[PDB]
RNA sequence: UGGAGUGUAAUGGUGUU
RNA sequence: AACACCAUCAACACUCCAA
């Protein structure tokens, strides 16, 4: 449970399709770079970079480095130092800096690591290279999180009010098969427009000009302007000095008063306008507008609008209106070719091969994106049943149930209707029409509604939920489903899930109000999928004969994900397959320490599933496929250490000396890796993304370890995010082709739609279970997520 | 709450007049 | 009570499901 497995082979299945990734090939010298520790007493990163810059130029006689922003420093060539601390002093129109030698980061070892010589890739080297590549834009651009942003060169994309659209990019140095690469992905966000506050007022209050009004209109405009400007920074323009607006004056600049404290003699009552007239010899062109209160309320510092400008680099947090969000998505999340050309454009205007800090270390980055071969895997046949037992073939990652019926359809004979929407806006005609339509779609799907509901009543208040269901359960012998019509976002849903999933173990299905009023066959169809799954039936199965050889022996599939609160316990969810299709899953959910991604009680959970598996299959799993979702790279060593043992432990304490092969895989949807079609004809749909099933396990993947990219879904909008799979462990010794095909095939067992999803069904289900347990003093709440006896044996989370 | 896709700080710590 | 720094994968919105 210590070392991750090396990549066994390279996949050869599927048709090859020429691709380009957003990785940029880097040329790195064999020189050793020198690392030094800094000690600065007592400061923000920008201040540190500035201080280091001064220290660089002011100590050139004694001693062109790159800087981390925090105590960490690197140089290309060595300098006059020793292990001894060398402390000095600098001055900013006042700091003490201590430079100490640390280490010699050899890039020869990096070439040896990328090559077959050394198995391990030195992390310190990756850190160093990243610091080098980031030192310039950390000062040149506006850093946000792990990205760098900036304004627009020519045109200015506006949003209205004081906002505008700033574009940016996220860079990170990554290792590859033979050559270090620079991963870069563009992004965009909303900053505050660098304009005079007078114009900020104009734009916020919908003024064509400031001279449209000469007297303030109302307190409400003061509140609106305050709501927009309170917290922002502004710079002054009659001296330079940057200030932070704390409030807005009620009174005009001509009447807003303050204690003048004119040297000795203390205070005299003076108005702001009069102050600017006397002190700064400035008559207010617009004395009638109120003032910005800056600094401390006790300090009484006020400023007229015509001397304040809003400083740039201020990102917005305020809510965005319809036009703002529209213009945002109408200028970002563009099609794949557009994003591609934007990244190319970015690599053109950033110009890394000309920057001095980059040139200092003799690094060369390719101005063209990385060409990668790639291959599109083959979609599995989906077997439907009914009288015809028709087959559905996924085309472009999507299929349909046209002239097809469920592999195992359930004849629904007893069901109920409980509408929580007001009858005023939800008539009985709506309910009856919805019932007819639903019955038709149901009978067509292979899950026939054999007759009218045995119950149909309006209601109100969450408090009506718990009593009623009991009554409903005791009156009608053998009811199968309870349908709950909801009027939109409501805590009622949460109570319906509480009573339904935990208390009685009754199959419940909520439907939003509007979908009862206006009904489309698609909605009713997917809804029927959900119903048929919730009642223990089987929508569709993978073609039995068309499966990887892993299915030749009893194998269980596990999915795991963790969800964290907005102080409250986090929750980890682990699901497991219960047949050999594999269509049916059972869910286990636990509560945990705050924001602890490492699943603590995993072992126990696994045990349950394993036990349940046997109970459902009368077979003991010879193999365990564990899809862990939600963990990033920096956690792997930790997670792989505990959870794998937790899995293994669960296999030992259960029966004898039973140790099946565990295949620990990590799913990742959150990463900065993009893929584009080289051939224009290979583009798919309006978004022009790569075809569903696109697999890449070369060039841009890990040099030694077992990882691969898989885009298993069709891009509906924007640019697809290819799901990343990193095999942290493999006892079954899978081949690349077999495991990739297995994954892509498990991406088709999602029962909520007739489409291929981005991540495998177990992981998705785990996410759904976790997010479901979210709606449901620590040991008290620990029993709140424990679902019902009968609910356990179902897929309620769907 | 029919479904899929993709766009965008909180805490504990040290410290401050 | 504000303000600095170091360690740490939920909401909202849009697109698509006529010819």
């Amino acid at each position: 449970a210590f070392k991750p497995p090396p990549r066994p082979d390279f996949g050869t299945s599927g048709r090859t399709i020429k691709l380009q990734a957003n990785f940029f090939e880097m040329d790195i010298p064999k020189i050793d770079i020198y690392h030094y520790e800094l000690d600065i007493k007592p400061c923000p990163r920008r201040v540190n970079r500035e201080i280091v810059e001064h220290m660089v130029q002011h100590f050139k006689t004694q001693i062109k480095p790159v800087f981390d922003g925090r105590k960490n420093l690197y140089t290309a060539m060595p300098l006059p130092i020793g292990r001894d601390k060398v402390e000095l002093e600098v001055t900013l129109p006042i700091f003490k800096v201590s430079i100490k030698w640390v280490s010699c980061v050899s890039l020869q070892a990096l070439h040896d690591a990328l090559s077959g010589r050394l198995p391990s890739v030195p992390f310190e080297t990756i850190q160093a290279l990243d610091v080098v590549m980031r030192h310039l834009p950390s000062m040149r651009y506006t850093p946000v999180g792990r990205s760098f942003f900036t304004a627009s060169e020519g045109c200015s994309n506006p949003l209205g009010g004081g906002r505008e659209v700033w574009f940016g990019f996220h860079q990170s140095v990554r290792p590859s098969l033979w050559k270090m690469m620079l991963n870069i992905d563009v992004s965009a966000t909303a900053f505050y427009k660098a304009q005079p506050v007078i114009e900020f007022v104009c734009e916020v209050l919908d003024f064509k000009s400031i001279e449209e009004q000469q007297k303030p209109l109302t307190d409400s405009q003061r509140v609106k302007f305050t709501k927009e400007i309170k917290g922002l920074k502004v710079e002054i323009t009659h001296c330079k000095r940057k200030y932070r607006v704390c409030n807005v004056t009620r009174r005009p600049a001509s009447h807003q008063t303050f204690p003048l404290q004119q040297e000795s003699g203390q205070t005299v009552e003076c108005t702001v306008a009069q102050y600017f007239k006397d002190r700064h010899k400035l008559v207010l062109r617009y004395p009638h507008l109120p003032c910005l209160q800056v600094g401390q309320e006790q300090k009484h510092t006020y400023l007229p609008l015509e001397v304040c400008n809003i400083v740039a680099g201020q990102r917005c947090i305020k809510k965005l209106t319809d036009n703002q969000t529209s213009t945002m998505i109408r200028a970002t999340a563009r099609s794949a070719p557009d994003r591609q050309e934007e990244i190319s454009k970015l690599m053109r205007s950033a110009d890394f091969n000309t920057d001095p800090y980059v040139r200092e270390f003799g690094i060369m980055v390719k101005d063209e994106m990385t060409d990668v071969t790639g291959r599109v895997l083959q979609p599995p046949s989906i077997l439907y049943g009914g009288r015809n037992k028709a087959i559905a073939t996924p085309v472009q990652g999507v299929w349909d149930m046209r002239n097809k019926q469920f592999h195992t359809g359930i004849e629904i004979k007893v069901w109920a209707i409980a509408c929580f929407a007001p009858q005023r806006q939800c008539t009985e005609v709506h309910l009856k029409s919805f019932t007819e339509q639903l019955r038709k779609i149901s009978r067509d799907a292979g899950m026939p509604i054999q007759g009218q509901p045995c119950f149909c009543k309006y209601a109100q208040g969450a408090d009506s939920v718990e009593p009623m269901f009991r009554h409903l359960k005791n009156t009608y012998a053998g009811l199968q489903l309870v349908v709950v019509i909801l009027p939109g976002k409501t805590p009622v849903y949460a109570e319906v899930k509480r009573v339904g999933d935990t208390v009685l173990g009754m199959a419940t299905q909520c439907v939003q109000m509007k979908n009862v009023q206006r009904t489309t066959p698609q909605t009713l169809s997917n809804l029927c999928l959900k119903i048929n799954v919730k009642l223990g039936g089987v929508n569709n199965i993978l073609l039995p004969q068309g499966r990887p050889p892993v299915f030749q022996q009893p194998v269980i599939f596990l999915g795991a994900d963790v969800t964290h609160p907005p102080k409250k316990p986090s929750i980890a969810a682990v699901v497991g397959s219960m047949d050999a299709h594999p269509n049916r899953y059972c869910a286990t959910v636990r509560v945990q320490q705050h924001r602890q991604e490492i699943i603590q009680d995993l072992a126990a959970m696994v045990r349950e599933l394993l036990i349940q598996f046997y109970k459902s299959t009368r077979f003991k799993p010879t193999r365990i496929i564990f899809y862990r979702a939600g963990v990033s790279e920096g956690q792997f060593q930790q997670v792989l250490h505990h959870e794998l043992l937790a899995i293994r432990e669960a296999c030992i304490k259960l029966e004898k000396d039973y140790q099946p092969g565990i295949t620990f895989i990590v799913v990742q949807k959150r990463h900065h890796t993009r893929l584009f079609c080289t051939d224009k004809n290979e583009r798919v749909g309006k978004s022009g993304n790569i075809p569903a099933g696109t697999t890449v396990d070369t060039k841009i993947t890990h040099p030694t370890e077992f990882d691969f990219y898989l885009c298993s879904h069709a891009g509906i909008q924007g640019t697809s995010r290819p799901s990343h799979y990193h095999v942290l462990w493999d006892d079954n010794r899978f081949s690349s082709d077999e495991l990739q095909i297995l994954t892509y095939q498990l991406c088709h067992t999602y029962v909520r739609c007739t489409r291929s999803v981005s991540i495998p069904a177990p992981a998705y289900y785990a996410h759904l279970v976790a997010f479901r347990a979210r709606y449901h003093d620590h040991q008290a709440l620990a029993k709140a997520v424990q679902v019902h006896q009968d609910t356990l044996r179902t897929m309620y989370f769907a």
Side-chain angles (χ1 to χ4, degrees):
Chain A
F2 293 97
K3 305 178 179 182
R7 179 164 17 226
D9 61 326
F10 293 97
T12 57
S13 176
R15 167 183 65 100
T16 66
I17 170 182
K18 279 168 52 58
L19 295 181
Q20 283 185 345
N22 62 299
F23 286 68
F24 297 92
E25 191 166 323
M26 297 178 54
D27 197 36
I28 296 186
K30 312 283 192 62
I31 309 186
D32 285 26
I33 63 184
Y34 293 75
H35 178 40
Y36 306 92
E37 180 180 344
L38 248 69
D39 190 6
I40 307 179
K41 303 177 182 179
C43 301
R45 303 157 70 261
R46 196 62 164 266
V47 156
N48 294 21
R49 302 184 184 278
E50 174 180 0
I51 293 175
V52 169
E53 192 181 353
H54 277 72
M55 195 206 61
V56 165
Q57 62 183 1
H58 274 336
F59 286 76
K60 180 172 293 183
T61 61
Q62 300 178 344
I63 329 100
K64 201 182 303 81
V66 294
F67 191 50
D68 179 274
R70 193 57 186 168
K71 93 198 319 166
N72 179 97
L73 187 147
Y74 300 87
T75 63
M77 283 297 168
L79 50 112
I81 33 73
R83 292 183 52 264
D84 58 344
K85 310 178 67 175
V86 181
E87 188 163 8
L88 49 89
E89 301 175 0
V90 288
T91 167
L92 174 62
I94 319 101
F95 292 90
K96 308 180 70 66
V97 185
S98 309
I99 296 187
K100 178 202 302 183
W101 157 272
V102 180
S103 62
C104 265
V105 180
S106 59
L107 301 181
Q108 176 66 25
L110 191 66
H111 287 72
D112 298 338
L114 294 180
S115 186
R117 319 194 184 284
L118 193 61
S120 301
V121 275
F123 295 95
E124 294 77 6
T125 304
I126 314 299
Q127 170 192 346
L129 293 168
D130 188 84
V131 169
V132 172
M133 303 304 299
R134 283 180 179 171
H135 177 76
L136 169 82
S138 298
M139 310 186 308
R140 179 155 290 171
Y141 293 80
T142 306
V144 169
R146 304 165 190 73
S147 306
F148 305 94
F149 290 89
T150 184
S152 305
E153 189 72 56
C155 51
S156 303
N157 294 100
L159 293 166
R163 293 96 135 175
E164 61 179 352
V165 179
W166 277 26
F167 300 98
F169 65 98
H170 167 267
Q171 77 172 238
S172 57
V173 181
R174 305 200 74 89
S176 176
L177 286 184
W178 285 128
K179 252 298 176 183
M180 282 293 158
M181 295 194 172
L182 188 68
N183 185 232
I184 288 186
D185 188 25
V186 303
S187 62
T189 175
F191 276 59
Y192 285 101
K193 184 177 178 59
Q195 59 180 343
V197 180
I198 199 70
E199 300 181 3
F200 179 82
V201 173
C202 296
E203 291 195 7
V204 167
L205 288 65
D206 205 339
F207 295 159
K208 305 181 188 176
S209 169
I210 190 46
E211 257 304 337
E212 266 202 24
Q213 76 176 35
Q214 294 80 356
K215 297 323 167 175
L217 167 69
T218 178
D219 310 25
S220 307
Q221 292 182 120
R222 275 189 24 254
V223 171
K224 188 177 182 66
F225 171 57
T226 307
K227 278 276 304 180
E228 291 287 332
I229 200 165
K230 179 189 295 182
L232 307 184
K233 288 189 292 185
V234 290
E235 54 186 354
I236 221 173
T237 54
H238 56 66
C239 288
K240 269 176 75 288
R241 287 183 171 190
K242 303 202 305 181
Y243 286 136
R244 177 170 294 272
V245 176
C246 69
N247 204 333
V248 179
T249 61
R250 319 181 189 110
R251 312 297 92 167
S254 54
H255 295 67
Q256 177 62 28
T257 54
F258 66 93
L260 191 57
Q261 195 136 12
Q262 40 176 58
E263 307 134 37
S264 66
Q266 279 280 77
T267 75
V268 293
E269 294 286 358
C270 185
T271 65
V272 178
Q274 187 67 23
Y275 176 76
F276 277 68
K277 184 182 189 176
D278 293 326
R279 172 61 174 83
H280 294 304
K281 297 188 181 64
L282 189 70
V283 302
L284 299 186
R285 202 179 189 184
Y286 313 94
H288 51 274
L289 287 85
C291 303
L292 305 177
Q293 187 172 355
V294 170
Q296 322 185 53
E297 300 81 348
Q298 59 99 350
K299 191 177 170 187
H300 294 289
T301 308
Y302 312 96
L303 299 170
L305 304 180
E306 58 177 339
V307 300
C308 296
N309 296 342
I310 294 195
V311 57
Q314 301 217 250
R315 187 168 57 82
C316 174
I317 315 181
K318 305 289 175 53
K319 315 176 181 179
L320 300 175
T321 58
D322 51 331
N323 307 98
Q324 301 183 335
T325 304
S326 178
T327 313
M328 186 67 62
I329 314 185
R330 202 165 49 189
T332 203
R334 301 175 179 178
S335 60
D338 289 77
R339 167 172 291 258
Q340 172 177 16
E341 265 302 334
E342 279 267 29
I343 298 178
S344 300
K345 182 184 184 185
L346 162 74
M347 210 55 181
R348 182 185 55 87
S349 309
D351 206 18
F352 276 101
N353 304 67
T354 56
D355 300 333
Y357 294 101
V358 168
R359 192 173 295 268
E360 171 92 329
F361 290 82
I363 304 183
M364 292 262 297
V365 188
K366 198 176 184 190
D367 53 325
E368 300 102 24
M369 267 191 301
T370 299
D371 299 328
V372 56
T373 65
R375 46 192 175 76
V376 178
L377 295 181
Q378 204 150 34
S381 299
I382 308 303
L383 186 274
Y384 281 97
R387 165 195 296 277
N388 292 129
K389 297 204 65 68
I391 314 179
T393 298
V395 184
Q396 216 70 237
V398 182
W399 74 91
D400 51 46
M401 292 192 310
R402 281 172 211 278
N403 306 81
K404 310 175 178 58
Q405 297 172 7
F406 288 140
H407 176 271
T408 299
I410 293 183
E411 298 186 1
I412 298 184
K413 248 165 287 187
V414 186
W415 53 289
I417 299 291
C419 178
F420 281 73
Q423 185 176 345
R424 175 154 294 161
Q425 297 184 57
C426 191
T427 65
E428 310 176 37
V429 186
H430 294 151
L431 301 180
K432 232 302 176 59
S433 178
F434 170 80
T435 303
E436 281 188 350
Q437 294 283 325
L438 187 144
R439 287 192 59 186
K440 177 187 178 310
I441 297 301
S442 73
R443 207 200 63 74
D444 288 22
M447 185 200 63
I449 301 297
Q450 305 289 62
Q452 293 300 315
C454 63
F455 183 84
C456 192
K457 273 172 177 182
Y458 292 87
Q460 194 178 14
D463 306 87
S464 306
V465 174
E466 183 178 3
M468 186 183 54
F469 274 67
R470 296 186 178 273
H471 159 57
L472 289 174
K473 189 178 185 62
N474 298 18
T475 311
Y476 311 99
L479 70 88
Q480 308 182 247
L481 178 62
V482 179
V483 181
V484 182
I485 290 84
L486 301 176
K489 294 299 158 178
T490 176
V492 172
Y493 174 83
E495 178 158 341
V496 164
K497 288 302 179 180
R498 180 187 59 86
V499 176
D501 301 339
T502 62
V503 179
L504 300 180
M506 302 172 59
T508 67
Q509 180 54 58
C510 300
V511 182
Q512 200 168 1
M513 165 179 161
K514 55 180 179 182
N515 299 332
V516 190
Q517 299 178 294
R518 182 175 57 94
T519 65
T520 62
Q522 184 67 65
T523 300
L524 303 172
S525 191
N526 291 114
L527 205 163
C528 286
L529 274 60
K530 298 185 74 305
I531 294 180
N532 188 64
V533 172
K534 281 187 174 183
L535 271 60
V538 179
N539 291 9
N540 53 44
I541 63 175
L542 296 175
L543 192 58
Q545 299 108 346
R547 292 176 299 173
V550 60
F551 281 91
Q552 294 179 356
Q553 297 183 7
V555 51
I556 184 179
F557 298 93
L558 302 180
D561 195 347
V562 187
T563 296
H564 313 297
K567 167 252 125 186
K568 280 178 181 180
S570 295
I571 39 103
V574 179
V575 304
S577 67
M578 294 299 149
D579 48 35
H581 291 152
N583 182 83
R584 211 68 206 184
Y585 284 78
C586 177
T588 62
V589 55
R590 292 292 200 273
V591 292
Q592 279 193 139
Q593 189 178 340
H594 315 293
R595 291 89 181 182
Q596 180 180 79
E597 193 145 63
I598 309 95
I599 309 179
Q600 190 74 31
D601 211 346
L602 173 65
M605 315 178 71
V606 172
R607 232 185 70 102
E608 295 188 19
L609 289 176
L610 284 175
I611 297 173
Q612 194 68 24
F613 181 91
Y614 187 60
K615 280 190 170 185
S616 301
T617 64
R618 290 294 150 177
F619 279 102
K620 298 182 187 177
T622 63
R623 309 185 153 94
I624 297 181
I625 313 299
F626 189 82
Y627 282 96
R628 185 63 161 85
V631 308
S632 184
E633 295 187 5
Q635 307 171 265
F636 279 168
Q637 296 180 345
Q638 307 165 3
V639 173
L640 176 61
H641 187 282
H642 175 79
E643 298 196 355
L644 175 59
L645 289 179
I647 297 180
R648 181 169 304 164
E649 172 188 4
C651 294
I652 306 303
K653 290 188 172 189
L654 192 283
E655 185 190 270
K656 290 221 183 177
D657 53 344
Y658 162 73
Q659 43 185 31
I662 304 97
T663 305
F664 208 107
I665 315 175
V666 169
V667 188
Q668 223 159 344
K669 205 187 305 174
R670 188 69 178 107
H671 57 67
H672 304 257
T673 301
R674 249 67 172 179
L675 293 175
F676 313 102
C677 306
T678 301
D679 282 28
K680 312 176 186 301
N681 51 268
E682 288 287 349
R683 305 187 206 274
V684 172
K686 159 191 171 184
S687 57
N689 271 126
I690 57 185
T694 300
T695 309
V696 172
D697 52 11
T698 46
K699 263 174 162 293
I700 67 178
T701 49
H702 200 265
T704 65
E705 294 176 359
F706 193 9
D707 69 327
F708 63 89
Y709 290 96
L710 174 58
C711 189
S712 49
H713 68 285
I716 307 300
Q717 193 205 26
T719 310
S720 306
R721 286 176 182 171
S723 303
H724 180 82
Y725 304 92
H726 197 134
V727 183
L728 282 183
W729 195 263
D730 187 35
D731 292 348
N732 299 285
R733 271 187 135 277
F734 272 98
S735 60
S736 295
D737 298 271
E738 184 175 2
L739 185 50
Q740 290 161 10
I741 291 174
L742 176 61
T743 301
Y744 182 56
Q745 209 162 330
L746 291 176
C747 286
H748 289 67
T749 60
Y750 201 66
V751 299
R752 309 217 302 185
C753 59
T754 60
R755 291 169 43 92
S756 178
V757 282
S758 53
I759 66 177
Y764 219 118
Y765 291 158
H767 179 89
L768 294 182
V769 172
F771 189 72
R772 172 59 64 88
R774 235 197 186 284
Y775 280 134
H776 291 167
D777 189 30
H778 177 269
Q779 293 183 351
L781 52 84
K783 302 182 178 183
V785 300
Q786 178 64 26
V787 288
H788 197 267
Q789 173 74 15
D790 310 30
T791 292
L792 268 170
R793 314 310 190 284
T794 57
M795 296 180 60
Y796 63 99
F797 47 88

